[PDB]
Amino acid sequence: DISAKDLRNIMYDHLPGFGTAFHQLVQVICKLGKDSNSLDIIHAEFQASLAEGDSPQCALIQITKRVPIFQDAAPPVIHIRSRGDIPRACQKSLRPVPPSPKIDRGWVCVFQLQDGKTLGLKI
Ligand SMILES: O=C(O)c1cccc(N2C(=O)C(O)=C(C(=O)c3cccc(C(F)(F)F)c3)[C@@H]2c2cc(Cl)c3c(c2)OCO3)c1
Numbered sequence: 065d066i067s068a069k070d071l072r073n074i075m076y077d078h079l080p081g082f083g084t085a086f087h088q089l090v091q092v093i094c095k096l097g098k099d100s101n102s103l104d105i106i107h108a109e110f111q112a113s114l115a116e117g118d119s120p121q122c123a124l125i126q127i128t129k130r131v132p133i134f135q136d137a138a139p140p141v142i143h144i145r146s147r148g149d150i151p152r153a154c155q156k157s158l159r160p161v162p163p164s165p166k167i168d169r170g171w172v173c174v175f176q177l178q179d180g181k182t183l184g185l186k187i
Pocket of ligand 1: 068087091092141142143
C-alpha cells in the first residue's frame with residue numbers, strides 16, 4: 065500500500081519551488097489522509113486530475129473539495145516554536161486566523177506558536 069511518505073514524495077515531484085504553501089498542503093493532505101486510511105483515494109484523485117490536464121496545484125485543491133475527509137473540515141493545528149520554523153516560501157501566505165477557517169476554503173493549517181501566537185496558512 066502507498067504510504068504517507070510515498071504520496072508526499074509523489075506530490076512534491078509535481079510542484080515547483082520548495083517549502084511553498086502547496087508543499088505544506090501536501091503535508092496536511094498526507095497526514096489527514098493517513099489518519100483516515102484514505103491515502104489510496106487521495107492518490108487516485110490526484111492522478112485523475114493530472115490526467116484531465118489540471119495543474120498539480122489545481123489537483124491538490126480539488127482533493128480538498130472532492131475527498132470527503134476534507135469537506136467542511138477545520139485546518140489541523142501544528143505546534144511550532146516560532147515563525148522562523150515555517151519555510152521562507154510560506155511566509156507571505158501566513159495570515160491572522162479567521163473565525164471558522166476551513167481546509168476546502170483554502171486554509172491549509174494553523175500554526176500554534178510557543179508564545180501563544182497563531183497564524184493560518186492560506187492558499
Ligand atoms: O507522522 C506521520 O505519520 C506524518 C504523516 C504525514 C505528515 C507528517 N508531518 C510531519 O512529519 C511534519 O513535519 C509535518 C508538518 O506539516 C510540519 C511540522 C512541523 C513544522 C512544519 C513547518 F513549520 F511547516 F515547517 C510542518 C507533518 C504534519 C502535518 C500535520 Cl497536518 C500535522 C502534524 C504533522 O502534526 C499535527 O498535525 C507526519
